[PDB]
Design a protein around this ligand. Structure first.
Ligand SMILES: COc1c(C(C)(C)C)cc(-c2ccc[nH]c2=O)c2ncc(N3CC[C@H](CNS(C)(=O)=O)C3)cc12
Length: 557
């Protein structure tokens, strides 16, 4: 019952890999301690292969089968449509990994006959064959972090032709099923503003609230064949077209359960008997499995008035406290149950009695004040990884702009407003690239966004208060300041000075640029401009944004 077996062949790159932070003329204005920033490469993949390779033991009790039966009853109310080739092709990112069969993502997006023909033959083969393991590529991801070094994460993905077929059979399932099965517990249905509201409302609804986050050590590797067959049995409860049922059963037996791993050089690296990180069902499967195991663990631990918030492999639980002794013992029993279900933790969970102390999705709730002095709750995170990635993106073009996603998702934060908006609007002004649409990810899905649309997007996700927050918490300020000293980032006063320049430059330009200057940099000036709602905010087609998670799912919206 090993998560992986290996041949000894190495995980190889597809191009030249840089691990050291690239430096240009704009680097120093953002970050001085360059040596602190690094990118993971395939050369550390051997260290990751060791960490993810282990035996899985699974003991399934009555709480587990009880929760499963309820999940299946809710799943039986779902009706899912089969997507056409064209529809599935349009969901493919432009920079998605090319096929081994002579076509790429642009060919798929342009509906080229060679791509469309191969997709049809892959589909027919899924319907005809339910036993042949589907080949996957194993690659090391190149992700940027600040030191204290993490080994590269591994991405396991089938061919582009299989990926388009997964969309046809399961895109509607993975987009509609989680919210039906989990209701309000499904976290990917919420914008950051709706998630804040949900958590504060849940925390308030308890007499003596207690909360914790459960961090499973390498979740993908803890996912067993049993778990993947349980997920398929959940998908099979839906009202599906007969071709979709057969494709789902085939994709499960041939791909989802496991299969051979091939490097970029076409060599066999070994065999996967756990979750693939680069399939359409990664996010949905992980969400369901985590919800199933955590809900059964909640029953085994006898947690009182339990409220969960699950999204992918990330889990937040809020419940009624029984005092620090009984809470510690309840969390030990919850951990023991999760361990038996093959989901042991990285760090053992800790009970928290202050909402602001619970960390999940690397985020925590914090408080600031609006223009009328009223308390406003927002989601924040340690700005180290966002700032390290922004330093990389200042000197190199990347297929996903993490700074853009970070401004969108963390717009109310002190660091996104003063540093990220200031730095990147300065770069866009100098290059006259304000109107150029940039790629970013929201819950694993890829989006092409125009920076000039940022004030309307932020209003819709966070409200106008996002442009007026002040009097941030001492804890938040100290965490931001501590990060700036560590990375060698200029103090917040320098950023204020730079923002007055960025704002004036945006205003001088009029139109949409002036709107950016007005709303995004109102914090920079003492004499504040009046921020009324934006007409274009209501015109925004923000559908598909907070519907589901698609991490590793190769989705473009
Ligand atoms: C819901 O919380 C999140 C927020 C909040 C709302 C806190 C701000 C913001 C982002 C996010 C941040 C920045 C850019 N884009 C984003 O999507 C975000 N991104 C991913 C995410 N995941 C939860 C676990 C998923 C990975 N596990 S897996 C492989 O099993 O699917 C990824 C949660 C997120």
């Amino acid at each position: 019952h090993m998560s992986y077996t290996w041949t000894g062949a190495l995980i190889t790159p597809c191009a030249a890999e840089e691990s050291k932070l690239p430096i240009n003329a704009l680097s120093n204005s953002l970050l001085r301690h360059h040596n602190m920033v690094y990118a993971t490469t395939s050369r550390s993949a051997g260290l990751r292969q060791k960490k993810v390779t282990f035996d899985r033991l699974q003991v399934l009790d009555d709480h587990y089968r009880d929760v499963l039966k309820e999940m299946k009853a809710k799943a039986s109310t779902v009706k899912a449509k089969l997507l056409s080739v064209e529809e599935a092709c349009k969901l493919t990112p432009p920079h998605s990994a090319k096929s081994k069969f002579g076509y790429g993502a642009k060919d798929v997006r342009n509906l080229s006959s060679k791509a469309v023909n191969h997709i049809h033959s892959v589909w027919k083969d899924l319907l005809e064959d339910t036993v042949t393991p589907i080949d996957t590529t194993i690659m090391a991801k190149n992700e940027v972090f600040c030191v204290q070094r993490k080994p590269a994460r591994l991405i396991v993905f089938p061919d582009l032709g299989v990926r388009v077929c997964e969309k046809m059979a399961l895109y509607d399932v993975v987009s509609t099923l989680p919210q039906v099965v989990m209701g309000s517990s499904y976290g990917f249905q919420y914008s950051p503003g709706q998630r804040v509201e949900f958590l504060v409302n849940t925390w308030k609804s308890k007499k003596n609230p207690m909360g914790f986050s459960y961090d499973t050590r390498c979740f993908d590797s803890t996912v067993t064949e049993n778990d993947i067959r349980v997920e398929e049995s959940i998908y099979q409860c839906c009202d599906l077209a007969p071709e979709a049922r057969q494709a789902i059963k085939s994709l499960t037996e041939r791909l989802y359960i496991g299969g051979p791993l091939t490097n970029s050089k076409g060599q066999n690296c070994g065999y996967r008997r756990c979750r693939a990180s680069g399939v359409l069902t990664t996010s949905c499967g992980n969400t369901l499995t985590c919800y199933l195991k955590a809900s059964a663990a909640c029953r085994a631990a006898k947690l009182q008035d339990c409220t969960m918030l699950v999204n992918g492999d990330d889990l937040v639980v809020i419940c009624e406290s029984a005092g620090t002794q009984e809470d510690a013992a309840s969390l030990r029993v919850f951990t023991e149950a999760m361990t038996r279900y093959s989901a042991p933790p990285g760090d053992p969970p800790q009970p928290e009695y202050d909402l602001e102390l619970i960390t999940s999705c690397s985020s925590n709730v914090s408080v600031a004040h609006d223009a009328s002095g009223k308390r406003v709750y927002y989601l924040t995170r340690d700005p180290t990884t966002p700032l390290a990635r922004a330093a990389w993106e200042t000197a190199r073009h990347t297929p996903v702009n993490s700074w853009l996603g970070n401004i969108i998702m963390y717009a109310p934060t002190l660091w996104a407003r003063m540093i990220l908006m200031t730095h990147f609007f300065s770069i866009l002004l100098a290059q006259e690239q304000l109107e150029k649409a940039l790629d970013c990810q929201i819950y694993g899905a890829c989006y092409s966004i125009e920076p000039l649309d940022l004030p309307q997007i932020i209003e819709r996700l966070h409200g106008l208060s996002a442009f007026s927050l002040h009097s941030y918490s001492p804890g938040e300020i100290n965490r931001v300041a501590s990060c700036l000293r560590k990375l060698g980032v200029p103090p917040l006063r320098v950023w204020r000075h730079r923002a007055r320049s960025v704002r004036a430059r945006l205003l001088s330009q009029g139109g949409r640029a002036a709107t950016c200057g007005k709303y995004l940099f109102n914090w920079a000036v003492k004499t504040k401009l009046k921020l009324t709602p934006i007409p274009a905010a209501s015109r925004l087609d923000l559908s598909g944004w907070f519907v589901a998670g698609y991490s590793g799912g190769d989705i473009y919206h």
